[PDB]
């Protein structure tokens, strides 16, 4: 039925009605002894009607309705992405599910996700009915329903009681690889945003610029045992694509660790001796020494002996206050040398991997959580920030560009004298512009990367710069040499839509203003890339569907 008492007829009903009408017409023309050609025409129409009923559009022009659309025959109910097979037999809609905008929560342990109270109440309403009647607070389902809809705080106590060990599944569309669905043990928060642990968020391929996520609750106890034993994020440390761990920090965590382990030639309290890492932590927190100061410290480490015992060793080593602080969280069994250098992303990755191979799963999990906490805290205390003065422009650049344009004028006038073909003139100009761009990039990196500061004894000495953007790139937290090159050095050649390279490179960097011409020609690459990814997604999805279909039978 429809508004106003109308009815939407399914197209199948109309096709059936047409076939019925043609059958009735043919039978009437037969039983009243019609002439030959009339009954032949009627039966040909009937055959065409049956063709329409089964597979309208399979031959010739398709039948159509008032909307000028082709009617969906029976065959169309099974063919195509809207077909019954793909839409319903696979990919069912499901009860006991919710969706919400995700949000960073750093205070969560590894295996627990923050779930809004309202969603929890709605999802577990049947369980709440059950337990509420079981504990005798409600007698009938009507009583339970009216009580839960009034949110009598005893319902909140029951709700806190029910979920205490009840894992839930979190899913992010598209579920590109099996990590896309994971299991978590919920924690109840007021608000309306689902809170994730950032480490697993990195694995989800998710971000926090507004990505939604869906949550399902398992019903049976075998199902929740499966969710705990198989799917819990504490198990999915190793990706299936390769043996390396998937739980790897990025962004602020890596920046914080990098800052914490970087040393400088001269700092507050350099050269003193600390009887233990605890005293290093004290001296830092009391403010009598900066993290970067190099110092000798007494440290104990352990090794897995030939029998399997953690035999101890203790010695004096040269290190930094920050490095001792970080070492204090390291579990027993790893060698101190793992820490005593500027820790980048790859160093942390191999550190987690070596922890997982040397020790069991749970020490690695605890190590990951401690890493996340300490990295965030010390990054915050660091106060790293980016300013306009940081993107230093190498003053050599003007000279190099003047040289390049002089050579361009030289080759152009050489062509004006007819001494060369135009194609080789183009090639020479392109080559000299590329050479100049590389020279400018090298000058920019050299100026940015290192700087001079006074030593303890009162003399100048070079050291790796603490320039913020360089620190972000060098740590591997974010960015790359290409992005830094574009930010400060001249960004160079760009391609016409045909892929050919424009003779005149974009000379201004991002810090100085780009003229309208440079900007306009640059937009070509931007829209090329956006269209590129837009198209690539579909092909990737299609290819994955294929591979899955071919290989789905194979089981050990």
């Amino acid at each position: 039925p429809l508004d106003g008492g109308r009815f939407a007829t399914s197209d199948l009903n109309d096709l059936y009605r047409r076939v019925i009408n043609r059958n009735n017409r043919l039978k009437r023309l037969l039983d009243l002894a019609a002439p030959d050609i009339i009954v032949r025409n009627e039966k040909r129409m009937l055959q065409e009607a049956v063709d329409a009923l089964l597979d309208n559009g399979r031959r010739g022009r398709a039948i159509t309705g008032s909307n000028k659309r082709p009617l969906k025959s029976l065959a169309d109910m099974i063919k195509g992405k809207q077909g019954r097979f793909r839409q319903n037999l696979l990919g069912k809609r499901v009860d006991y599910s919710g969706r919400s905008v995700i949000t960073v929560g750093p205070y969560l342990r590894l295996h627990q996700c923050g779930l809004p109270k309202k969603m929890a109440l709605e999802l577990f309403k049947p369980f709440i009915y059950g337990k509420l009647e079981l504990r005798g607070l409600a007698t009938t389902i009507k009583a339970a329903k009216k009580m839960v809809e009034r949110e009598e705080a005893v319902v909140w106590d029951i709700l806190d009681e029910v979920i205490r060990e009840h894992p839930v599944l979190l899913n992010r569309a598209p579920t590109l690889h099996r990590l896309g669905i994971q299991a978590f043990e919920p924690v109840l928060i007021e608000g309306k945003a689902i809170q994730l642990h950032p480490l697993v968020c990195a694995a989800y391929n998710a971000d926090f610029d507004g990505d939604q996520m869906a949550v399902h609750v398992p019903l049976t106890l075998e199902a929740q045992l499966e969710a705990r034993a198989l799917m819990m994020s504490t198990n999915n440390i190793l990706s299936p694509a390769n043996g390396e761990p998937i739980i790897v920090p990025s962004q602020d965590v890596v920046l914080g660790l990098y800052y914490m382990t970087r040393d400088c030639v001269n700092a507050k309290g350099e050269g003193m001796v600390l009887t233990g890492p605890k005293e290093a932590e004290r001296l830092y927190r009391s403010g009598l020494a900066s993290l970067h100061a190099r110092v000798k410290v007494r440290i104990t480490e352990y090794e897995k002996d030939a029998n399997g015992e953690l035999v101890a060793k203790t010695s004096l080593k040269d290190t930094t206050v920050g490095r001792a602080i970080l070492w204090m969280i390291v579990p027993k069994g790893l060698p101190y040398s793992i820490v005593n250098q500027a820790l980048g992303k790859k160093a942390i990755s191999k550190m987690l991997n070596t922890c997982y191979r040397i020790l069991g799963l749970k020490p690695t999990v605890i190590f990951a959580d401690q890493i996340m906490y300490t990295g965030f805290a010390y990054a915050a205390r660091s106060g790293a920030s980016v300013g306009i003065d940081d993107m230093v422009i190498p003053e050599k650049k003007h000279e190099i560009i003047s040289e390049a344009e002089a050579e361009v004028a030289e080759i152009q006038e050489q062509f004006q004298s007819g001494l060369v073909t135009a194609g080789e003139r183009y090639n020479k100009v392109i080559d000299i512009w590329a050479a100049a761009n590389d020279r400018v990039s090298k000058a920019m990196m050299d100026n940015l990367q290192t700087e001079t500061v006074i030593n303890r004894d009162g003399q100048e000495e070079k050291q790796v710069s603490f320039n913020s953007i360089y620190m972000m790139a060098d740590s591997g937290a974010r960015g790359s040499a290409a992005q830094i090159r574009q930010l400060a050095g001249m960004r160079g050649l760009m391609a016409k839509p045909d892929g050919s390279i424009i003779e005149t490179p974009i000379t201004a960097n991002f810090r100085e203003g780009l003229n309208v011409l440079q900007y306009f020609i640059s937009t070509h690459g931007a829209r090329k890339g956006l269209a590129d990814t837009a198209l690539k997604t579909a092909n990737s999805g299609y290819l994955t569907r294929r591979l899955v279909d071919v290989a789905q039978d194979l089981v050990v």
């Binding site: 009903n13 059936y16 009605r17 019925i20």
Partner: protein, 51 residues
């Protein structure tokens, strides 16, 4: 309508144990046919089944 695309006499009643004629209304006659019409006293689920 009788003999129509939705003819209850063929496909069964529109409602559980309700004859089109209104002859019978409850499960006391469950599984019997009406005499005024060929509809059967059964559940609506049969509507999904019968071809």
């Amino acid at each position: 309508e009788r003999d129509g695309l939705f003819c209850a006499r063929i496909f069964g009643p529109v409602k559980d144990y309700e004859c089109l004629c209104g002859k019978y209304k409850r499960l006391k006659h469950r599984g019997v046919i009406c005499e005024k019409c060929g509809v059967e006293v059964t559940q609506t689920k049969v509507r999904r089944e019968r071809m």
